[PDB]
Structure formats: C-alpha cells, structure tokens
Symmetry: D3
Amino acid sequence: SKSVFVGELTWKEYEARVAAGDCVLMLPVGALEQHGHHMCMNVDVLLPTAVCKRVAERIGALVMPGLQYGYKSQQKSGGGNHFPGTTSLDGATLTGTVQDIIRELARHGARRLVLMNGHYQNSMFIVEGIDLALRELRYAGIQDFKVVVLSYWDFVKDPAVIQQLYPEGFLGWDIEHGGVFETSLMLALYPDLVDLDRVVDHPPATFPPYDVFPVDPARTPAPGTLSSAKTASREKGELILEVCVQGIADAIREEFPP
Amino acid sequence: KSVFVGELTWKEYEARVAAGDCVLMLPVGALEQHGHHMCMNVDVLLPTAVCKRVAERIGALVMPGLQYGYKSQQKSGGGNHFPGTTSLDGATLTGTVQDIIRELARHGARRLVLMNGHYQNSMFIVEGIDLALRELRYAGIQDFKVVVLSYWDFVKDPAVIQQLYPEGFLGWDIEHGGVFETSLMLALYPDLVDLDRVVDHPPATFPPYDVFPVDPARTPAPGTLSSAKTASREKGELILEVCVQGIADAIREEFPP
Amino acid sequence: KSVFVGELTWKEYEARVAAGDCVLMLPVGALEQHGHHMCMNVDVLLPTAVCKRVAERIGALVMPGLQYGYKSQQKSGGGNHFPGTTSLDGATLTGTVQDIIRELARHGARRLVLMNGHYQNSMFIVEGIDLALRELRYAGIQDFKVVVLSYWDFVKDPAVIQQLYPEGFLGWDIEHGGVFETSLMLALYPDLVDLDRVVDHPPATFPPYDVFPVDPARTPAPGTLSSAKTASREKGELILEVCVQGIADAIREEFPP
Amino acid sequence: SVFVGELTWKEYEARVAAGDCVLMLPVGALEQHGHHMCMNVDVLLPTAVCKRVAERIGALVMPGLQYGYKSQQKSGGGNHFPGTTSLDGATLTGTVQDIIRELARHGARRLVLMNGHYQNSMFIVEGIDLALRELRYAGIQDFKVVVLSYWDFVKDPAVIQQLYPEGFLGWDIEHGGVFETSLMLALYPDLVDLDRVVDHPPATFPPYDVFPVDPARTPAPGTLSSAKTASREKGELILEVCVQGIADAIREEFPP
Amino acid sequence: KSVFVGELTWKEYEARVAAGDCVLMLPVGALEQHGHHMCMNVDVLLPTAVCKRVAERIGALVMPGLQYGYKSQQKSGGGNHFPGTTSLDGATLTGTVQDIIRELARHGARRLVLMNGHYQNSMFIVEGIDLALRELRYAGIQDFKVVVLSYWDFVKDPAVIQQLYPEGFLGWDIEHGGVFETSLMLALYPDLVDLDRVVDHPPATFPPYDVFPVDPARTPAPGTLSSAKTASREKGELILEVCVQGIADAIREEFPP
Amino acid sequence: SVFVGELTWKEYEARVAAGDCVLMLPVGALEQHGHHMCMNVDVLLPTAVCKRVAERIGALVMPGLQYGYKSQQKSGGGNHFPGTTSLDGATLTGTVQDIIRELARHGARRLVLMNGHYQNSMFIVEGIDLALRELRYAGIQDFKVVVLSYWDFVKDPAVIQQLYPEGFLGWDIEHGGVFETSLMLALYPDLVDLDRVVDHPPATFPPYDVFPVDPARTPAPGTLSSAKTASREKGELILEVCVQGIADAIREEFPP
Ligand SMILES: [Cl-]
Ligand SMILES: [Cl-]
Ligand SMILES: [Cl-]
Ligand SMILES: [Cl-]
Ligand SMILES: [Cl-]
Ligand SMILES: [Cl-]
Ligand SMILES: [Zn+2]
Ligand SMILES: [Zn+2]
Ligand SMILES: [Zn+2]
Ligand SMILES: [Zn+2]
Ligand SMILES: [Zn+2]
Ligand SMILES: [Zn+2]
Ligand SMILES: [Zn+2]
Ligand SMILES: [Zn+2]
Ligand SMILES: [Zn+2]
Ligand SMILES: [Zn+2]
Ligand SMILES: [Zn+2]
Ligand SMILES: [Zn+2]
C-alpha cells in the first residue's frame, strides 16, 4: 500500500521506487530507555520516526522500520544503564545491525540513506556500522552509496528558537534527558504517552568533567531525568517539530539532489 | 495503559517486574517480500498482534519487536535475492537476542517468551538464548526461564486445517505469503492487503535439498510459494482464535502466577 | 585409489580438480548421545558412509568430516544436558564451513555437496555457505555452486516408509536413536550397536514450543525419542540404497559432467 | 620512574601490594595534525599529563595505546588523510578490555583512562563495560575506573579567555588548533613548527555527517582551526590547570 | 572395550567420567600436502595412532580428532598455496578447542591431553585452552587441568636420533614429509605411502625471515622440506614405541589417581 | 626523523609519494624480565633495531605495539607474573590487520614487521594473512610483507661462540638472559641493573605444557637463564650483526 514506510509497501512498490535511481531511504535509530516518571520508554524511537515520516512526505523519501534497541544509556547524558526498563545492546550488536542493513540496501540497488538518530549514545556505533559497510561495498565494487547521519535535535540551533524554548537560558544537550525538548515533542505528537503531573521538579543535573564505572546511582537524580520538564508544552513541541522537519528536509535536498 | 513495555514509564515497568512473576514477550520478525498483494512487515505485524492479544489475555507485557531477521531461504521464503527483503547475518540476530535477555535479567525479570514470525529465525533465536543463559549462569543466575515458539506451530488440529485448506495441506514450507498469512492480515490489517493483486499460481515444489547461490528461476516470480486467492478474513479470525488460545494456555502452563 | 581426499597425495587431488568439473563432498556430523544401544559418533559415521558410497558411485571425492556439530536440541536429539554430547557454538561451526569453502575455492574447486547427519546443524551450515559465497564474490568468484542436504530427507517414498514403519511414521525430529538410525547402523556398523540394550518406550510427545534451560524431565531418560526395537539390518540396507540412489541422482542433476 | 614499562616486575608488584595503587592508561592515536605538528600528539599529550599527575599523587602510568579509533571529519579532519592509522572499534574496545582484565589479575583495582583522541571515547567506554561485566562473572566488583579526556578540565572562564581572547568554539573545530599546539610548544617544542601553520577561518559544518567522507569539506591542511595564536605560555597554563584538576579528581575518586 | 569416546554409548562414557580421574585425549591435526609419496591426513592419523596406544596402556579415552588445522607455513609445511591443503582461520581453530573444553567440563571431566600433529596449530590450541579456562573460572571451576603436546617432542634421546638420522639431525623445522613422518606411516599405514614416489632432494634452506604473499619458488617443488628416502618401517616402530612410552609416563606423572 | 609518529602528514605523504618507501612496525610486549630489567624490553629492542636499520636504508618506523600475546611458561616465564599485561590473540591479530589495511590506504606497499616478543609470531602472521586477503578483495595484490624476529639474524657460529663461550642452548630458554640483557646494556643502560641478576642454572622443562600455569615450574626470578655474563660489548656485537643482517635482507626483498 502506498505509504512513506517501507514496511507498509509490497516489494513491487519498493522496487518501483528504487528503480527511479535516486530514491532516498531513511532509517530511524532509537532505544528503549527510561524517561523519568512522566514519559514512556520508547520516546527515542517515536520522535525520530515522527520526524522521518514528515520529512519523507515533503521530499518524497521512504522510511525503513526503525531500530528499537540502542546502545547503553550513559550517566551524564541519559541517566545511566542501571534503571529498570532501559534495554540496551552491546556496541558490536548495534554496529552489526547497521552494517547488515546497508549491505542489504546496496543489494536492492539503493544508493542513498539517511540515518536519523534519536538516542544520544548511538552515534559512534552507527558510524562504525557505516564505515564497515562502505568498506564491504568497495570490495563488492560499489563506491556510489552515500550516507548522511544526524541526530534530529542538532537542527534546533536557532537562537530565536532556543530563547522561545528556553526563556531562562539553554544549558546544552548535555542534560536534556527527558526535559523540555523531548517532553514538548511528545506533548505535540503523543500526549496520551505523557503525564506532566508526574513531572518531578529539580535543578539541572551537574557532573564533574569525568566518568566513573561502575556507575554510581547516587550521582543521577532519582527520577532519571537530568532537567525538569515543568515548562514543556504542546506549542513548544510544534515549534521544534517544524524547525527540525524543515531543516532536515532542506539538508537532504542539498545532499541528495534529484 | 497498554501491554507494550515501550509505552510504560520505567516506574510502571519496575512495579510489574516487582510482582516477581511477571511475563515478558518479544516478537521476532523480518522485513521481507510477501508477493504482489501484501506489505513487507508481515512477519513483525502478525507475531506482534498475537503477542498483544495473548498478553492482554494473560497479563503479560510486550517488548519492542525485532524488525529485522535472518536471511530468507528459497524453499520457505522465496530467497534473499528479492528487493525490499532486508536481512541480518545470523550473528547479529543472535547477539540482539542475547543482549536483550541479559538486560531483562538485570531488571530482575525472569520469564520471557520469544514469539517468532519469520521461518529462518528459529535457530539464531535459540543460539541467542543459550549464550545468554550461559552468561547468566556465570553471573550466578539460573532461575531465568525462556519459552520460544513460532506462532503457526499452534495450528495443528485437522478440523482447523480442514477449513483453511479444503483441498490439502502441504506444510509450513510452502506457505510463504499464502492463505495462512494473507488470511491473518485480512483479519488484522486489511488496509495492508490487496487481494486483487494476488498472482494465482500452482504450488511450488522443491527437491529434498538446497542450492547456493539461490537460483531465482526456482522461485515463483511473484515471490509467493503458493496462491492466496482463497484467503479470507474469516479464515484469519479462525487462525487468530487458535493461536491466541493455544499460546495463552501454554504460557499459563509454563509461567503460573 | 580412494574417494577420501585425506587418503590422496596433493598431486592426485590436484589432477582430479584439474578436470574442471570435480565434485567434492563434506559430511557434517556430531558427537551426541544416542541412547543405551548405540555409540555417540553415529551422526558422523552415517553421513560419511553415505558420502563414501555416493562419491564412489558418481566419481566424486569426500573431504574429512566435521566431527563436532551444533548443540543437541531437546525435541530433536534429547538435549545438550547429556554427558558425552560435545557441541560447538553456532559461530564455530559456521566459521568452519566458511573456511573450508574458501580453501576449496582457492584449489580451483567449484562444486560442493554438504551432507548433514545431525538435525540441528542445517542453519549454521547455511550461514557458513552464505558468508563464504559473499567472500568469494568479493574475490571475483561467482561460479562456485553448493548443494546442502540432510540424507534422511531422501527417504520420502510412501512405499519405503511403509516397509520401515508399518504402524506409522511420526517424523524426523522424533527419530533420534530410533528405527531409522539403528537400522542403518545394523547394516553398516553392527559392532557399535546392541539391540539388547534398547529401551522400548512409547514415542516422545512434545508441545509446539521449546523451554530453556532444558528440563531433563521432558526427555526420555534413555535419551531416545522413540524405540528402535523393530530396527533391522534389512531395513538398514533398504534405507542405504534409497539414500545413495537418490543423492547420486540429485548430484548428477545439479552437477552434470 | 612512574612508568610501569620502566619498572621490574618486583618493583611493580611491591607498588600494587600497597593495596591502594592507582594506575593510569593514556589512550591516543596516530593521526594527522596539520602541516605544523607531528602525528603522535594524541599519545604525547595525555602521556605527559599522566606523568605529571602520577608524580604528584603517587600513581603509575601504563604504556600508552598508540593507535585509536578512526578520525572523523567534523572533529579530526577525516580518515582520508595520509599518515592517520586507525583501528576498528572492536580492536580498540578489545585492547582496553584485555588490559583491564590483566590489571585485575595483578590485583590492581583502580584505573584512570586518559583519552587524548576525541573519537576514542565511546569505544573506551564499551571496553570498560565489557571488562567490568567479565570481572563480575569472576567475582570481582571492587575494581573502579575513572575515564576522562584531559581537555574537559579546562572549563574555568578565566582560563578560557586567556587562551581565546576572541572567544571559544567547542572542542570540535579545535583539531590541530590553539589548545593542542600550545601544549606541544611547552612540552615538545621540537615536534612543532608553528611557522608552517596554515591560517584559515574556523571550519564550519552543517548539523550532520556525510559518508564516504568528502575531502572538500575539511580544510586542506587538515586543521579545523588556526594554531597561529598558540604559545608556550598558553601551554604552561593549560598544563598546570589540567594536572591540578585531574590530580584532585583522582584524590576524591580514589581516597587513600 | 574401545578407547574411543565416539564408539561408546553415553552411559559408558558417563560411568568412566563419573568414576573420576578420567583422562581425555584430543588429537589435533590438519588436511595438508605431504609430498608425492604420502596422503594428506597424515597429521590426523599419527597423533590419533599415538593416542590410541597410550590410552590403551594408561586407561584414557580418546576424543574424535580435529581434522582441519591452522594454515600451513612455508618454513615448516611448504606453504598454504598447495592444492589439497585445507586450513582454518586461527579464530575458528581456537574456538573449536574452547568449545570442546567447555563441554568436557560440563560432562564433569577435568583432565585433558591435547595431542598436536600439525606444526602450526600450537599457539591457536593454547589460546583455545586459555579462553576456555577463563570461562570455566567464571563458572566456578578451577580444577580442570590441560596438558598440550606435539608427539614428536618426545623423540629427544640422542641414541634414538642417531638410529634415525646417522647423517645428523637438523631440527623439526625442515622435517615435513620427511624421514620421521614417512617412517611412522610405513609402520602404521604402509598402504598410504609409496617411497617409489619420493623426490630425494636436499634439505630446504630459508633465510631468517618470512615473506607474504608466500613465494612459491622458495619451497621445494614436491612440497617436502627434506627427503624421506631413508625412511623405514623399522624406524617407525622405534619412534612409535618411544613416543608412546614417553607420553604414557608423562600422563601418569601429570594425572595421578 | 625515521619515526612516522614524529613526522607531519605532509612529510609522511611525500616519503610515500616516492612509491618505494619501506615501513617498519615494531611488535613488542609488556612482560616481566627478571629482577634485573624493566618490563618494556620487548618493545625497546625491536624499536632500537628498526631505528638503526631505517637510518641506513632510508625507511620509516611506525609506532610499535606495546602489548603482545600472552607470556608462555617455557619461553617467557608465564602469564601469572604481576606486571605482564597481555592481550588475547584476536586483539593482537586485529591490530596488525587494521594497521596493514591503513598503510595500504596510504599507498604504502612495503612493510617489515619486527617482532621482539617470542609468543607474538603466529598472531602477527594471522593478522597479515587476514589483511592480505582483504586487500585482495580490494583489488590490491602488490602489498609485500616481511616478518622477522630480530634474534633470528644472530646465527653465525663465530658470533655465538663469542656470545656463549660455555655454550649456547636456544632462544626458547633465553628469556631475560645474556642476549636481551646485553642489548639493553648497550642501548638502555639505565633500564637494567645487572647487580640484581639471580645466577641460576638454565631452566629445564619436559616436552609438554601444563595449564593452568604451574608457578613452581618457572625459576622464581622469572628468567629462564642467567644473564650474569651479559655485557655492553656483547650487546654492541649483537646490535651490529642484527642491524646489518636485516638491512641487507630488506634490500634483497625490497630492491630500490
Ligand atoms: Cl536521550
Ligand atoms: Cl515466512
Ligand atoms: Cl539426530
Ligand atoms: Cl583530536
Ligand atoms: Cl607437519
Ligand atoms: Cl621473550
Ligand atoms: Zn530520549
Ligand atoms: Zn536515549
Ligand atoms: Zn511471512
Ligand atoms: Zn519471513
Ligand atoms: Zn543421530
Ligand atoms: Zn544428532
Ligand atoms: Zn589531537
Ligand atoms: Zn585525534
Ligand atoms: Zn605432517
Ligand atoms: Zn602439518
Ligand atoms: Zn624479552
Ligand atoms: Zn616477551
């Protein structure tokens, strides 16, 4: 059935799109991770997938089934992998998954992929998956496969937007786990999966300039959040979404011209 | 408030695991061609839909499904040479299963059902289970129990088979994108099926061995191993009934409250 | 001369592959418990005997067999909890098949038959074949052909099944250390079988799912899934000729001179 | 000596026998650093910082990892450059894992990993997690690890302004810039020829990455920022700031 | 009554292991070219022959041998460029040894003798042992002991060496398909040897370094590194008794009741 | 400088641009060497030999590998000694493999691997094979590798009689003995305290190995033979013989 999601297409519909010779494919990469007492744990898959869908509808791309499990949650950016519910993969597993998928897409005749990450710690493993796959493609005689990797939040860098989102100053994505940014998007996209009343208020989380292992539960706010989402809103969610969708769409048109 | 783990907050999940008798379910599928008439995420949709109903019926939680599975085999899945089909190497599937089990044990969970919806996944899901349990044993854990199954194995009653194929069954090794799955999809996701696109062809026959590289000439052009022309919502509802009931009973038997 | 590669000098082997259409055969077995009446190397002995005879009949050569195979499954071979059974992890068996194919391709060989004698080996043998062919492709080789088979799949004639099981045939999984293998052993290695130790118990019945860790209480104590009481040298010789004939014909078809 | 490689096994054994010995492991890379610096800067710098920290707190420094993870365009220029010799992530993770396993066997239980190569981080972390998982299966849960990239200890605004009068722009476009070149000028003056620096505006990248890496998107010299204003004085400043801060972090994480 | 684990039922193996002090022996060889006069499974045949005799004298059990070994190196086996030679990657061999030790420990065995018959295998067997022992420690097992040995290292007595090479020994480096092995073969498997085919060329001379890719011209065309012209059944029986006696005593020493 | 780590990528690129440049990679280990020597001996010696050889033939030396494969009892004392820090075989193999892959990406096609740790051999060899296999898949078949253990070049009876009057015995029993100790005295005199040598008779082992390692089977000092008769003079003889032998071998295998 006609859709922007590859999973909803028959192989003939998929084949027809790739036969175009310039088809863009998008792959959401998330995680199953705790997101405080106010949001569900599949946030990292829901948000990038929602972004991909909208971008795909505007530029005419297709969206691959997203990767539901990501790399281990880090303390200073995701709370820590000691919370229950958070289910993480080892680095080699996530890399191997990205690598196999690129190898397969190349077999289909696809040559354009956008990897949209929604989980802070996935980046380097996604990157190693790309490198290893491109290496194999070369051995197979393929050097025209192009890949763009990005975390959708990096497109929200406009001062005017930042001020709107954070009237009291932005302290970097360093502590934006389950905070204003993600809660806003969820309020605008999946309100039934958020209960702002369960939001535990507390000052931003601050850590020294180093990490300790084993992780020290005490150095992470009990709720699992690194900053309060008390000021999150549907309107903020709407602004962030249009900003990301438009930025990413224009980025793709630039990198993958017809 | 659903049965999906991904839709709970960690506090809600922790509370469930806290009962000490909580049962977790994990669908393992694949992105694979399913003829001209069906979408490619059938192997994820069906076991996920079965897990949801079983979980609702017995009080279990459902983990996010594995969207990508093992390579497609010709004598059961047409072959991994079709476009769209996106398969992982066996080591990657095994490692994914193994990692998930390790994490569940860490949560304190000790009961897991793995519901496969893609033929070739089985042995790789099994190696994952074995490697994870060996690992849990090294960590001093030996009370984690796992039940693994392919939902179609629960459709054995002849009376049932009689109604689905009132002409003769030929085995789950000829039913790729045929009456069985198509009927389930018509009952569960009619918008993802278009019976008017079905390529009605005779059943495909294979010798008692496999050839590599896969020879495309030995698979029906549409990718199906048999015709889904006689598929229907009613057959789908019959199958669903049977699967949910049988699997639900099996879990009550293996994981008593 | 001999059909076993191991018993040839490199010069003879080289001359054989130099013909450009030489067929090679590799038996893949296992060291697994086979009840109170049979030895544990059955899974290697049988496929090797079949390859030997098939190879001699059609002019192929046989590679040293793989003595260790994948983990024994409960509903297939009793379970990997038994003493004696010595299994490899999936990646290990896969890597072995993959390395051997790579080497054969280096020799100039382009035709291989993998004959499995242990139920659970299949998928790992398949993954080994796939990863090998992927590599050969990177090396610019796409003319290497492989045929994988389990020798018991050629015994599918109702007339033969009837002569073997008048009372009825349940399947290949429940045939662990039963009439089939014991009959072949009586005709091939009678000194390694003792019918007097056979435990004549009813056929093992299993639910449509697997439980892990394996529960010993669910597998017949002797390790067999069905009685080999009615086994015989006569049945064994019938099985052997059907298997050798069928496999030799398949090879001649897949690998014409 | 504070370096393990310069001790006999008996001297090393005696030190760890104290029961509270802290070991340090520099993790660098062989990577291009512009026309003005040699390629082993990522090894030299953390090793120099470790040596000085160890001398002040009584720790030991392990031989440094000479090879690190693949250089990334937006933070290191890209792995398409000559000279840069990178390991696959699994190779680096495994090396870190093996070393931690061996140290646990010696009886050591305190390790500080000082990274000097940006992209090494996530792979050093995985190496730590896999090793600790192993140590747990072995019945060891008292092995503690502190991991850090020495440049993160330079966060005091007073210091930043003295290093960057015009302003600062994150440790991304720093590759081969002021920070590193200034340290080399103070520690290894003969391995840096500032006269060969190629002045150019700080590299700007869009909020995404492209593979295969496009050579045209990295400044020709391989630097992401100009080292023109780097100096020995800035070097001495950075050095003392990092040595003191890290020495104190270690005292708190690993009290005697 | 046999000493081969493969020829026992699982109940027989279980009794021997449960009896305690059971010593298992595992031959590790290779499929490798051995000149114009010998077959290619020599490296499996010899250590297996030695294990058999030792096990019969000391009451040990011998496991199915590893048929494929590590890549052949020029300065010791001619080079992995010859046809017939079928080598495994190091990790595959290491993993196979690790898996078997893990399983023997599960059976309850705690004593193992790895008898190597292929020069290049040694370090990969060692890593296998180490990775396996590390794993056993995680499992709480620290009383599993392993002895690894190349059977030729037991032929050290000057007297014996004089009777074998009256012209002067020259180390095992240049001893491939030469007098030592060809003699053991004449005494154990004369059928697989044909001295008439021996190429009496002088010992191979190599520089103190190795080159890759291997240069074919630096290895004697026959594949042997020394002539086996002076090999004899007599020499074979001498070496055999020497190795058997030495290995037997060594085992009694390392594995006391 | 002959050290790649000391060159800028521009310098390195120019040298490789010649199209006949020879690279050399020292492969060592962090391993106990008795009571009289430091533990980085296996890295220091091959690196020292490479430096001298490279200066004579105009080659370049890559950063050496600091950690090698596990120490074996009958040749290195045993991996049970404190201080010895070994990698698993897969890790060392992967390291060699990755480096070769990168040198190929550079355009280099000539590599000399100089092993200074007895137990590294087979894993270095497997790394090379895996690398060449992969290079073949990339359409590259003109990459040539020479592997060697520097001690294999001291084969002249005249040199041996001169080094071991009372008789030689074999590299397997040489761990921390006269050979390595003499080289250290001539090259790194500050890292060796001959006065700490334990003068015990050569070690004797049966023709087999036992695992787990039995500590009682290794001389207590960790040495397999006495270095009491080691000297700076002997070291200079060894060094010149090795340097000249390797230099000439490299000329024959990698002709100008
Ligand atoms: Cl996050
Ligand atoms: Cl299917
Ligand atoms: Cl079976
Ligand atoms: Cl950097
Ligand atoms: Cl040999
Ligand atoms: Cl040594
Ligand atoms: Zn999130
Ligand atoms: Zn996240
Ligand atoms: Zn399906
Ligand atoms: Zn499927
Ligand atoms: Zn069997
Ligand atoms: Zn079996
Ligand atoms: Zn740097
Ligand atoms: Zn760097
Ligand atoms: Zn041999
Ligand atoms: Zn050999
Ligand atoms: Zn040494
Ligand atoms: Zn050493």
